[PDB]
Scaffold this active site. Structure first.
Site, PDB file in Angstrom:
ATOM      1  N   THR A 112     -57.406   5.116  28.463  1.00 30.59           N
ATOM      2  CA  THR A 112     -56.480   6.276  28.226  1.00 30.59           C
ATOM      3  C   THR A 112     -56.906   7.601  28.849  1.00 30.59           C
ATOM      4  O   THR A 112     -58.086   7.839  29.113  1.00 30.59           O
ATOM      5  CB  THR A 112     -56.385   6.542  26.713  1.00 30.59           C
ATOM      6  OG1 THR A 112     -55.918   5.371  26.055  1.00 30.59           O
ATOM      7  CG2 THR A 112     -55.390   7.642  26.331  1.00 30.59           C
TER       8      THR A 112
ATOM      9  N   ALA B 164     -55.861   0.746  20.145  1.00 30.46           N
ATOM     10  CA  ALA B 164     -54.405   0.852  20.090  1.00 30.46           C
ATOM     11  C   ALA B 164     -53.884   0.666  18.673  1.00 30.46           C
ATOM     12  O   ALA B 164     -53.159   1.514  18.157  1.00 30.46           O
ATOM     13  CB  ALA B 164     -53.766  -0.169  21.015  1.00 30.46           C
TER      14      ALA B 164
HETATM   15  C1  LIG Z   1     -57.027   3.894  27.664  1.00 31.83           C
HETATM   16  C2  LIG Z   1     -55.781   3.237  28.303  1.00 31.83           C
HETATM   17  C3  LIG Z   1     -58.121   2.828  27.819  1.00 31.83           C
HETATM   18  O1  LIG Z   1     -59.278   3.295  27.104  1.00 31.83           O
HETATM   19  C4  LIG Z   1     -56.773   4.241  26.100  1.00 31.83           C
HETATM   20  O2  LIG Z   1     -58.014   4.559  25.452  1.00 31.83           O
HETATM   21  C5  LIG Z   1     -56.034   3.170  25.260  1.00 31.83           C
HETATM   22  C6  LIG Z   1     -55.452   3.764  23.984  1.00 31.83           C
HETATM   23  C7  LIG Z   1     -53.947   3.475  23.949  1.00 31.83           C
HETATM   24  C8  LIG Z   1     -53.608   2.079  24.478  1.00 31.83           C
HETATM   25  C9  LIG Z   1     -53.483   3.558  22.497  1.00 31.83           C
HETATM   26  N1  LIG Z   1     -56.923   2.149  24.729  1.00 31.83           N
HETATM   27  C10 LIG Z   1     -56.763   0.871  25.038  1.00 31.83           C
HETATM   28  O3  LIG Z   1     -55.924   0.450  25.831  1.00 31.83           O
HETATM   29  C11 LIG Z   1     -57.681  -0.072  24.275  1.00 31.83           C
HETATM   30  C12 LIG Z   1     -59.069  -0.139  24.869  1.00 31.83           C
HETATM   31  C13 LIG Z   1     -59.733  -0.841  23.869  1.00 31.83           C
HETATM   32  C14 LIG Z   1     -59.805  -2.224  23.933  1.00 31.83           C
HETATM   33  C15 LIG Z   1     -60.451  -2.934  22.929  1.00 31.83           C
HETATM   34  C16 LIG Z   1     -61.020  -2.260  21.857  1.00 31.83           C
HETATM   35  C17 LIG Z   1     -60.942  -0.875  21.788  1.00 31.83           C
HETATM   36  C18 LIG Z   1     -60.296  -0.165  22.793  1.00 31.83           C
HETATM   37  N2  LIG Z   1     -57.010  -1.375  24.286  1.00 31.83           N
HETATM   38  C19 LIG Z   1     -56.632  -1.995  23.162  1.00 31.83           C
HETATM   39  O4  LIG Z   1     -56.821  -1.574  22.023  1.00 31.83           O
HETATM   40  C20 LIG Z   1     -55.880  -3.291  23.436  1.00 31.83           C
HETATM   41  C21 LIG Z   1     -54.407  -3.002  23.332  1.00 31.83           C
HETATM   42  C22 LIG Z   1     -53.748  -4.273  23.865  1.00 31.83           C
HETATM   43  C23 LIG Z   1     -53.677  -4.231  25.379  1.00 31.83           C
HETATM   44  C24 LIG Z   1     -52.320  -4.366  23.342  1.00 31.83           C
HETATM   45  N3  LIG Z   1     -56.166  -4.366  22.473  1.00 31.83           N
HETATM   46  C25 LIG Z   1     -57.203  -5.203  22.600  1.00 31.83           C
HETATM   47  O5  LIG Z   1     -58.036  -5.151  23.505  1.00 31.83           O
HETATM   48  C26 LIG Z   1     -57.233  -6.312  21.537  1.00 31.83           C
HETATM   49  C27 LIG Z   1     -57.683  -5.806  20.175  1.00 31.83           C
HETATM   50  C28 LIG Z   1     -58.983  -5.076  20.385  1.00 31.83           C
HETATM   51  C29 LIG Z   1     -59.630  -5.123  19.147  1.00 31.83           C
HETATM   52  C30 LIG Z   1     -60.041  -3.955  18.516  1.00 31.83           C
HETATM   53  C31 LIG Z   1     -60.693  -4.021  17.291  1.00 31.83           C
HETATM   54  C32 LIG Z   1     -60.940  -5.251  16.692  1.00 31.83           C
HETATM   55  C33 LIG Z   1     -60.534  -6.419  17.323  1.00 31.83           C
HETATM   56  C34 LIG Z   1     -59.883  -6.353  18.549  1.00 31.83           C
HETATM   57  N4  LIG Z   1     -58.095  -7.419  21.997  1.00 31.83           N
HETATM   58  C35 LIG Z   1     -57.642  -8.395  22.810  1.00 31.83           C
HETATM   59  O6  LIG Z   1     -56.487  -8.476  23.230  1.00 31.83           O
HETATM   60  C36 LIG Z   1     -58.704  -9.449  23.145  1.00 31.83           C
HETATM   61  N5  LIG Z   1     -58.425 -10.292  24.330  1.00 31.83           N
HETATM   62  C37 LIG Z   1     -57.540  -9.714  25.364  1.00 31.83           C
HETATM   63  C38 LIG Z   1     -57.391 -10.781  26.390  1.00 31.83           C
HETATM   64  O7  LIG Z   1     -56.732 -11.792  25.748  1.00 31.83           O
HETATM   65  C39 LIG Z   1     -57.694 -12.499  24.952  1.00 31.83           C
HETATM   66  C40 LIG Z   1     -58.007 -11.620  23.845  1.00 31.83           C
END
Ligand SMILES: *[C@@](C)(CO)[C@](*)(O)[C@H](CC(C)C)NC(=O)[C@H](Cc1ccccc1)NC(=O)[C@H](CC(C)C)NC(=O)[C@H](CCc1ccccc1)NC(=O)CN1CCOCC1
Ligand SMILES: *[C@@](C)(CO)[C@](*)(O)[C@H](CC(C)C)NC(=O)[C@H](Cc1ccccc1)NC(=O)[C@H](CC(C)C)NC(=O)[C@H](CCc1ccccc1)NC(=O)CN1CCOCC1
Ligand SMILES: *[C@@](C)(CO)[C@](*)(O)[C@H](CC(C)C)NC(=O)[C@H](Cc1ccccc1)NC(=O)[C@H](CC(C)C)NC(=O)[C@H](CCc1ccccc1)NC(=O)CN1CCOCC1
Ligand SMILES: [Cl-]
Ligand SMILES: [Mg+2]
Ligand SMILES: [Mg+2]
Ligand SMILES: [Mg+2]
Ligand SMILES: [Mg+2]
Lengths: 125, 195, 204, 196, 212, 222, 222, 233, 195
Positions: free
Chosen positions: E1, E49
């Site tokens: 982000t 997210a």
């Molecule tokens: C920028 C874009 C990147 O840092 C921002 O900070 C954004 C915030 C916006 C989207 C609100 N953050 C993210 O995109 C964030 C980065 C991140 C990833 C993982 C943990 C913490 C921060 N991404 C996510 O939260 C994504 C959102 C998805 C794309 C819809 N989710 C995941 O990665 C999930 C859940 C993560 C998680 C957090 C806490 C506990 C358990 C899980 N994980 C997966 O999808 C795992 N993986 C992905 C590939 O498919 C197999 C499973």
């Protein structure tokens, strides 16, 4: 725990325990509140059958809840301390979470809510 | 959170606290006030773990203010410091301890004396003529050992404090963005706006 | 600290009718930080084209190494090296560093000057040859490229049609990868002419 | 594995199961763990299949070179070459070998070489994971100067039990008879030995 | 982000990107990282997210309950503190949130509060949060003045996100703009970086590193 | 140490049209390099014209679907048989997922149906509850293969109008159910070729105002 | 991978699948795992792809030089011995799992070699990830005194078991028959039971769809 | 958090035209030690279900007791306990699958792999798998452990898909099961020669066969195998 | 070692390098020159692991000077940068690699063009209009993307550089004690004494 429903309805639709609590208020020393244009004044009676009193240390009738709110009362003195303590704690708790002191209405609403809770809680009068 | 200093002089306690709030490789803020007024003549500065510091400071503040209302009376700096220490002493054996170090600067109105207390996160209390938390001490203590006198005025204390800040600004690795200085004396608490 | 995904980048190669195409993105970064948008990953030694993905220092090193080896090959053999032969040279050179490998994903592409046959090939970092009729993919968005190429590709495309197919495969794969993009280049290679085109893509 | 070698009146008999494992998977159920390093000097292999093969191959090379220069080597000499390899490379080997041979002077001899690379000359020897289950049985039933038929029954019954209890052992029971007469290979299948 | 929000003469600008990543995998390019809590309150989302999305919609429920009970819109300070006290209870559990509570009230005026998952709560005029926060700061700080017009301010917020979207690999997609005034917040559109970059490059004459 | 999670492979795909929506998924169930079932459905009709799939760890996926199905049932009991709108279902699922934030359901969840205006809707979830409405979404093992193809063919990304100097984009438009099923079938055959966990069979659930229809197609079994 | 070896009357036959993986991704759908060491000695390889090819080429080179030096046709035991000593020296780090087979003046032979340097002899063998599926078939249908045509059938059936049931194996079946007194016949793509079905749609783009910034002629000539 | 001690290996099964067949050897291994030889790992529930269990035997005995108690509980205040309201295979399975998943969710699993084989009241074949993780799946053939790797390939040659089920007789199906058990005896190091086999037919009902043995084994070719490469003697 | 920047403008290359040398919680020096002249028209700045940086820089310097004497000829910036990259490319697979990142600013006298090369410790070379190593890039790159033009003068480049330093001084956590700025052009190398 002691569970007894002490405050209950009577055939005529009255909660005698609440009404008898009003009789205790009627027995208490007179307290008066008058608000002017830019001020409020709280007057309180002190019965004169008690001489040899120490007025320095004797609990005052008017109590500060916060630096901007005061509370006077009529009725059982011991009971009033419990309400004042709860009100003072809530006043500081409000400043902590809302970052602003209580309004007089909010503080009144809280105190009133406590009084109400004791009219339909088991084991309490 | 990093630099908090304290100097007790003849008639006042002076607290200096860094303004920088850093998270990662970014200085998020350069005007942060790392202190809370516990009572009209008692001031507490703080430093340590993020979140814990302010949460702890405000929790203490609320408790002291509650006491003041209840008794219509101001607690002595000694009493406040003992209360704070006990809270930290409870905390260290909790499930998650407060990682907060504090300095409590106060003016005792009954004794007519300034008082400075240094309390670390373990609940280790000491009354001092001058105090510091963190790496600040490693420079300032030796400097104050040399230049400090017990009969100094508030103005002399501020010059002594300027000497500490200059040394920190010269030899400290991190940029702490200067300090907010506050004075606690018989007339209460006030802030020095130009430092 | 995964050498193959520090700098990022992708390479893709396709065959067509009497032609081949090889394309690459232009990004060079340091993890999240994008550093250069001019970092080409496709080189050529005579008429043989080599695309290399992976760790940028090894990409540069191997280019210089294969330039070195092909220049000597030509002096001794008195002719330019062919794709099939160069492919074996790349494999030999990579496996020579079996237990301390270059972190790369090279891709050979070109047309044999004698037979006229289109030729592409891919390798893993230790030199295993992956020969293919259709397409070869490499990089941080190899999964994306596999999906695009496997659905978009069809045999015996003409140079002008092949250009569109390979370009769209690269662009849409690159947009689903954080470490790839920042520009793109496509080489269209015919028997005796080669066209190089820079693509317009989103710069994020 | 379950392996053993037993001396008797006319010479010595080597015995072994035929199971090779990769975890709980049987990679080979008809393995030959009895291997020739010289005309009448054989060995039973246990432990790593790669290590024991590499060792036996080197030993066979050494004894072949020995024979070219100095004539037929003793069973003790063979055991010494095994030991030398197993001891000097103890940090990189997993090999439990039993060496058995027939001289005309010394008759049947058995040497066992455990993990450390120590050498132990014995009347009979057992080794391998399945040997643990037959220490009691073999100790109670072994006698010196047995006949060929008695020794075959002893090995058969012993490895039968080893195979029964050890999951790492099984298949067929191979045997090699070393006497003045020559070299005789024997085999015994599940249907026979299981119902003993 | 990448997300930002700054205070200025004409109120508050809030700008965010719309990318979502799961490692190097670009999962989404159309994520709403601004949560509309009420007509005078906004919340930016950075980090986890689900954590941000879940707890900031929960925050709006708590802000609604406040104005029902108190017959008055919640202050920005009180709103931010509900969220900060909430995440503080979960401290150590592994929440990942970097939020900014932006809004206007009578008593406060335009106000921005930075709130993160490790309990930090800061009032301030300028904040940039996210993996590309540094890139946004660079442009924003170097061009920021209090006396910016509403037009120039909106562009700076948009341009700052674009700068980060370009350099930071985990930032991109599109820019979402908001302007907060005494009358409340105003949405100023979704701007795709795909078109915006080239438009800005051509008109502004910047981004000379890129092959035009 | 006991690992409570597993990977059952498979991949799913949800596309939204103008007045319909599809939710497809392969029928292969795997563990490591073994095939457990060649036909084990993981796309379900949950009632109220909502179709759902939770791909990843099957045990968690089945539990989630089971719970949402049950949530729909109780929504009827508690709210006078009111129809659960797709947007309301999505929010409900967020709370189901986030309720286990600290011991997550290891699944990528996708639901599909029609919104309250009758238009096609697809919602996609991460394992802990972050959700977003989209026209297009692939989830699971081969999502990285399929998704960029969908960007190109459904949303017309990187496609410009011929002769316009790459200045005019290819205009967005809704696809027919026939064109969408072609993209689904081609996406899954491509994924089957290049991904080892994808194959055996393809089951598509189509949602219109008339109801929920099914279509099945064979896939390579290697 | 799935690879097998089966002995018969007058020779030996080996077979293999044609899938090459890179994690869960199929890198090559038609790679050749059957290697020629000498004209009548062939090798099926499983494990690390570069290692099987490099080690089979190295030994094959040295076998050729040996054959020229000795004025004799090379023997399978020579290749076997050279391979196992090479593999043993590297302590399993060269991840080559081979089935070595051939005919020579001594007769017909069938061996397997593992990465750590151990060798096995047999009438039927199987290596690779699909070896269990293949061995199940071999254990069920193998018998003594197989004919050439029976052995090819058994071998290809064993590979098919791997293709269908093992995710690590797939695509086609390669075979090499080594019969005594005859030339070895390498049957590339002996079976092709995994042909890709026709796609539903052609994705040939309109010319000019891709936006271009620059064009230039590249100089390949001197 | 557990670790399995006394274990049972493969359980194999398949559907045929009128019912299901399921089999499992009678061994209770203790690591590499083949400790217990009289262990029954097929447990009938009523006259229409057989639960085959692999993995930890102590947890298997626990499940036996649960199933035994389930039958008792179902009979309570149930006049139709031996008729319409009798236990179905699908009821028994869903119960076990609920337990298995609840236990894994409490990080204290029943270290097992279970196959519930039976015939429903309407005559439909039931065959479904569940394990320590709570993972469930159904297929014409199902097998646990090594059976998944070696038996399934053989059983799938007979019933490769749903349409092959009506074409498969009980004679052919049983032959394939018995063959698979032999292959497992050849190749699984923690298997035994002795096994049990159960057939649940919609016409002939439950047929429970005990004390079966693997036979018609091929071992003769072993005599020809000498050495590991060069050795001729 | 921390901040090294580089800006190539129309007729010159400008290198800015931080003056601070920090070890532990002490700034040991605030006037350190993190650069070496490789030849009359080639300058290399450096940053990274302590000891390695200077050892590497001087080793390169000696090699280039040796070349200049041998051939009575100055190597081009491109040639020097390629030589440096190869040395780092060898180094990364050594027993103990040089952990040094460098910028090479030079003026090619044959082409009459300024040239800036950025090379990291892995041996990753890139020619750039502007470059940085370490955390500096995370602020300056976006800033230069905005304000940089290719036809700028040396004076405009210095103002652009001042803008970068100001931003770093505002948002960087550590105090890097300003920068030494050097200009490389057709007339050789010279230092800006007042920055
Ligand atoms: C920028 C874009 C990147 O840092 C921002 O900070 C954004 C915030 C916006 C989207 C609100 N953050 C993210 O995109 C964030 C980065 C991140 C990833 C993982 C943990 C913490 C921060 N991404 C996510 O939260 C994504 C959102 C998805 C794309 C819809 N989710 C995941 O990665 C999930 C859940 C993560 C998680 C957090 C806490 C506990 C358990 C899980 N994980 C997966 O999808 C795992 N993986 C992905 C590939 O498919 C197999 C499973
Ligand atoms: C009985 C079984 C036990 O005493 C016997 O001793 C037999 C001896 C005969 C065959 C000579 N031993 C074996 O069968 C032997 C058991 C063994 C296993 C591991 C270490 C030492 C001994 N089995 C093997 O050697 C097999 C032979 C293969 C199947 C042809 N090899 C392996 O299992 C190799 C072992 C690699 C190794 C590791 C450590 C020390 C030495 C060698 N392993 C593999 O191929 C990979 N395997 C995959 C599953 O995870 C474990 C390793
Ligand atoms: C079946 C399919 C599996 O058992 C067969 O055995 C086949 C055998 C034939 C093809 C020889 N095996 C494979 O396909 C084999 C499986 C494998 C994978 C990884 C390690 C060991 C075995 N696949 C490969 O060897 C691929 C071949 C490529 C696709 C042509 N190679 C890789 O995946 C390499 C692994 C290299 C390696 C290095 C050191 C030790 C062992 C293996 N992996 C990569 O290239 C991964 N990555 C890609 C980007 O660049 C950075 C590395
Ligand atoms: Cl062996
Ligand atoms: Mg990208
Ligand atoms: Mg056994
Ligand atoms: Mg980006
Ligand atoms: Mg597949």
């Amino acid at each position: 725990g002691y569970d007894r429903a002490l405050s209950i309805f009577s055939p005529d639709g009255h909660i005698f325990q609440v009404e008898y609590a009003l009789e205790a208020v009627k027995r208490g020393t007179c307290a008066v509140g008058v608000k002017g244009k830019n001020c409020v004044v709280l007057g309180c009676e002190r019965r004169s059958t008690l001489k040899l009193q120490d007025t320095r240390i004797t609990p005052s009738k008017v109590s500060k809840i916060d630096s901007h709110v005061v509370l006077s009362f009529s009725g059982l003195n011991a009971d009033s301390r419990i309400l004042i303590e709860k009100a003072r704690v809530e006043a500081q708790s409000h400043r902590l979470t809302l970052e602003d002191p209580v309004t007089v209405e909010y503080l009144t609403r809280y105190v009133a809510g406590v009084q109400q809770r004791y009219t339909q809680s088991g084991g309490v009068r | 959170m990093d630099i908090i200093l304290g100097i007790r002089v003849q008639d006042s306690v002076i607290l200096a606290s860094s303004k920088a709030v850093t998270r990662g490789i970014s200085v998020l803020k350069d005007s942060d006030d790392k202190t809370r007024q516990l009572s009209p003549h008692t001031l507490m500065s703080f430093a340590g773990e993020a979140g814990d510091t302010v949460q702890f400071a405000e929790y203490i503040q609320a408790n002291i203010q509650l006491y003041s209302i209840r008794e219509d009376y101001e607690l002595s700096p000694q009493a406040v410091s003992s209360f704070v220490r006990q809270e930290l002493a409870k905390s260290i054996r909790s499930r998650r301890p407060y990682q907060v170090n504090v300095l409590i600067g106060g003016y005792d109105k009954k004794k007519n004396k300034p008082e400075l207390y240094q309390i670390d996160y373990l609940g280790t209390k000491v009354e001092l003529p001058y105090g510091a938390h963190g790496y600040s001490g490693f420079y300032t203590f030796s400097l104050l050992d040399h230049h400090y006198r017990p009969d100094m005025t508030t103005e002399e204390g501020l010059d002594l404090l300027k000497l500490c800040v200059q040394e920190l600004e010269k030899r400290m690795p991190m940029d702490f963005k200067g300090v907010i200085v506050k004075i606690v004396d018989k007339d209460g608490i006030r802030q020095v706006d130009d430092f | 600290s995964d050498p193959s995904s520090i700098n990022g980048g992708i390479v893709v190669a396709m065959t067509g009718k009497d032609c081949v195409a090889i394309a690459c993105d232009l990004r060079l970064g340091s993890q999240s930080l994008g550093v250069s948008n001019k970092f080409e990953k496709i080189f050529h030694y005579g008429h043989v084209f080599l695309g290399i993905t992976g760790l940028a220092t090894d990409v540069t090193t191997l280019n210089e190494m294969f330039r070195y080896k092909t220049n000597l090959y030509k002096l001794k053999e008195e002719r330019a090296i062919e794709p099939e032969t160069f492919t074996q040279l790349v494999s030999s050179s990579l496996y020579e560093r079996r237990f301390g490998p270059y972190f790369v994903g090279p891709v050979v592409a070109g047309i044999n000057s004698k037979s006229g046959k289109p030729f592409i090939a891919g390798f893993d970092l230790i030199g295993c040859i992956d020969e293919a009729k259709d397409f070869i993919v490499s990089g941080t968005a190899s999964d994306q490229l596999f999906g695009m190429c496997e659905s978009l590709y069809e045999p015996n495309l003409e140079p002008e049609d092949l250009f569109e197919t390979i370009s769209q495969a690269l662009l849409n794969a690159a947009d689903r990868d954080a470490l790839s993009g920042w520009g793109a280049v496509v080489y269209i290679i015919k028997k005796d002419e080669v066209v190089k085109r820079y693509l317009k893509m989103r710069q994020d | 594995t379950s392996i053993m070698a037993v001396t008797f009146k006319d010479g010595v008999i080597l015995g072994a199961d035929s199971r090779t494992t990769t975890g709980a998977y049987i990679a080979n159920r008809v393995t030959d763990k009895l291997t020739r390093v010289h005309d009448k000097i054989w060995c039973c292999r246990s432990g790593s299949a790669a290590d024991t093969q590499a060792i036996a191959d080197i030993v066979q090379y050494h004894l072949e070179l020995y024979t070219s220069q100095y004539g037929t080597p003793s069973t003790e000499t063979a055991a010494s070459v095994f030991k030398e390899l197993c001891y000097e490379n103890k940090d990189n080997l997993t090999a439990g070998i039993i060496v058995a041979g027939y001289d005309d002077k010394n008759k049947g001899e058995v040497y066992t070489i455990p993990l450390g690379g120590s050498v132990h000359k014995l009347p009979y020897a057992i080794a391998g994971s399945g040997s643990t289950f037959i220490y009691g049985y073999c100790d109670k039933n072994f006698r010196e100067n047995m006949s060929k038929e008695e020794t075959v029954d002893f090995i058969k019954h012993s490895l039968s039990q080893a195979i029964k209890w050890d999951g790492s052992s099984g298949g067929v029971i191979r045997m090699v008879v070393l006497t003045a007469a020559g070299v005789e290979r024997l085999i015994f299948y599940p249907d026979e030995y299981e119902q003993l | 982000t990448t997300t930002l929000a700054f205070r200025f003469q004409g109120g508050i600008i809030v700008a965010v990107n719309s990318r979502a990543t799961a490692g190097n995998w670009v999962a989404s390019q159309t994520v709403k990282k601004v949560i509309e809590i009420n007509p005078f309150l906004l919340g930016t989302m950075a980090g986890g997210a689900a954590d941000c999305q879940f707890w900031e919609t929960w925050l709006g429920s708590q802000c609604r309950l406040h104005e029902l009970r108190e017959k008055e819109r919640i202050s920005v300070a009180a709103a931010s503190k509900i969220l900060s006290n909430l995440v503080y209870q979960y401290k150590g559990a592994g929440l990942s949130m970097g939020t900014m509570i932006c809004g206007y009230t009578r008593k406060e005026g335009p106000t921005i509060y930075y709130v993160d998952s490790d309990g930090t709560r800061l009032k301030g005029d300028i904040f940039c949060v996210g993996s590309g926060q540094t890139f946004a700061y660079g442009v924003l700080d170097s061009n920021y003045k209090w006396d910016l017009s509403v037009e120039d301010a909106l562009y700076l917020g948009k341009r700052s996100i674009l700068a980060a979207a370009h350099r930071d690999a985990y930032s991109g997609g599109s820019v979402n703009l908001y302007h907060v005034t005494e009358d409340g917040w105003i949405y100023h559109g979704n701007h795709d970086v795909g078109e915006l970059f080239w438009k800005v490059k051509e008109e502004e004459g910047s981004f000379n590193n890129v092959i035009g | 140490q006991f690992n409570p999670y597993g990977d059952n492979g498979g991949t799913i795909l949800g596309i939204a049209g103008e007045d319909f929506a599809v939710l497809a998924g392969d029928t292969r169930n795997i563990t490591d390099y073994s095939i457990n079932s060649r036909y084990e459905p993981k796309v379900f009709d949950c009632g109220d014209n909502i179709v759902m799939s939770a791909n990843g760890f099957a045990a968690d996926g089945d539990a989630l679907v089971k719970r949402f199905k049950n949530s729909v049932k109780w929504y009827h009991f508690d709210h006078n048989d009111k129809k659960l709108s797709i947007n309301s279902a999505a929010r409900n699922i967020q709370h189901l997922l986030y309720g286990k934030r600290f011991f997550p359901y290891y699944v990528h969840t996708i639901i599909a149906g029609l919104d309250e205006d009758g238009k096609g809707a697809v919602y996609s979830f991460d394992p802990v509850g972050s959700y977003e409405r989209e026209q297009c979404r692939a989830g699971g093992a081969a999502a990285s293969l399929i998704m960029p193809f969908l960007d190109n063919q459904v949303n017309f990304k990187n496609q410009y109008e011929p002769g316009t100097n790459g200045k005019v984009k290819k205009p967005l438009k809704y696809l027919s159910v026939e064109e969408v099923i072609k993209l689904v079938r081609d996406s899954f055959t491509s994924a089957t070729e290049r991904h080892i966990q994808v194959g055996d069979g393809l089951e598509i659930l189509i949602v219109t105002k008339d109801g929920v229809r099914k279509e099945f197609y064979e896939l390579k079994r290697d | 991978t799935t690879i097998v070896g089966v002995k018969f009357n007058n020779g030996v036959v080996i077979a293999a699948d044609t899938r090459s993986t890179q994690g869960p991704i199929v890198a090559d759908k038609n790679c050749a795992k059957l290697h020629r060491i000498s004209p009548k000695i062939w090798c099926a390889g499983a494990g690390t792809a570069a290692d099987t090819e490099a080690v089979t080429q190295l030994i094959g080179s040295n076998i050729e030089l040996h054959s020229l030096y000795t004025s004799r046709e090379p023997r399978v035991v020579s290749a076997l011995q050279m391979l196992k000593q090479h593999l043993f020296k590297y302590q399993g780090h060269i991840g080559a799992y081979l089935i070595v087979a051939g005919v020579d003046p001594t007769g017909s032979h069938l061996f397997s070699i593992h990465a750590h340097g151990s060798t096995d002899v047999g009438y039927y063998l199987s290596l690779g990830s699909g070896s269990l599926a293949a061995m199940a078939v071999l254990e069920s249908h193998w018998k003594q005194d197989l004919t050439k045509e029976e052995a090819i059938k058994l071998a290809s059936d064993a590979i098919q078991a791997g293709i269908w049931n093992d995710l690590g194996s797939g695509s086609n079946v390669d075979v090499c028959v080594m019969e005594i007194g005859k030339d070895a016949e390498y049957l590339r793509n002996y079976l092709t039971p995994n042909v890709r079905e026709e796609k539903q749609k052609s994705y040939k783009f309109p010319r000019g769809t891709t936006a271009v910034l620059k064009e230039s002629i590249v100089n390949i000539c001197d | 958090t557990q670790q399995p001690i006394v274990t049972g290996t493969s359980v194999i099964s398949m559907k045929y035209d009128n019912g299901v067949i399921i089999a499992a050897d009678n061994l209770g291994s203790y690591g590499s030690l083949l400790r217990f030889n009289g262990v029954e790992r097929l447990i009938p529930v009523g006259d229409n279900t057989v639960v085959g269990i692999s993995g930890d035997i102590s947890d298997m005995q626990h499940i036996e007791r649960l199933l035994k108690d389930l039958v008792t509980e179902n009979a309570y205040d149930n006049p139709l306990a031996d008729a319409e309201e009798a236990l179905e295979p699908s009821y028994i399975f869903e119960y076990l699958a609920t337990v298995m998943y609840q236990r894994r969710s409490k990080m204290n699993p029943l270290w097992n792999a279970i196959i519930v084989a039976g015939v429903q009241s309407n005559g439909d074949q039931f065959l479904r798998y569940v394990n320590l993780l709570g993972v469930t799946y159904s297929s014409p053939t199902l097998a646990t452990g090594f059976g998944a790797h070696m038996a399934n390939p053989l059983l799938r040659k007979v019933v490769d898909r749903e349409s092959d089920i009506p074409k498969t007789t009980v004679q052919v199906a049983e032959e394939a099961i018995v063959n698979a058990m032999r292959v497992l005896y050849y190749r699984d190091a923690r298997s035994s020669r002795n096994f049990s086999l159960a057939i649940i037919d919609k016409n002939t009902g439950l047929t429970f066969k005990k004390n079966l043995q693997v036979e018609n084994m091929k071992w003769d070719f072993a005599k020809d195998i000498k050495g590991y490469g060069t050795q001729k003697i």
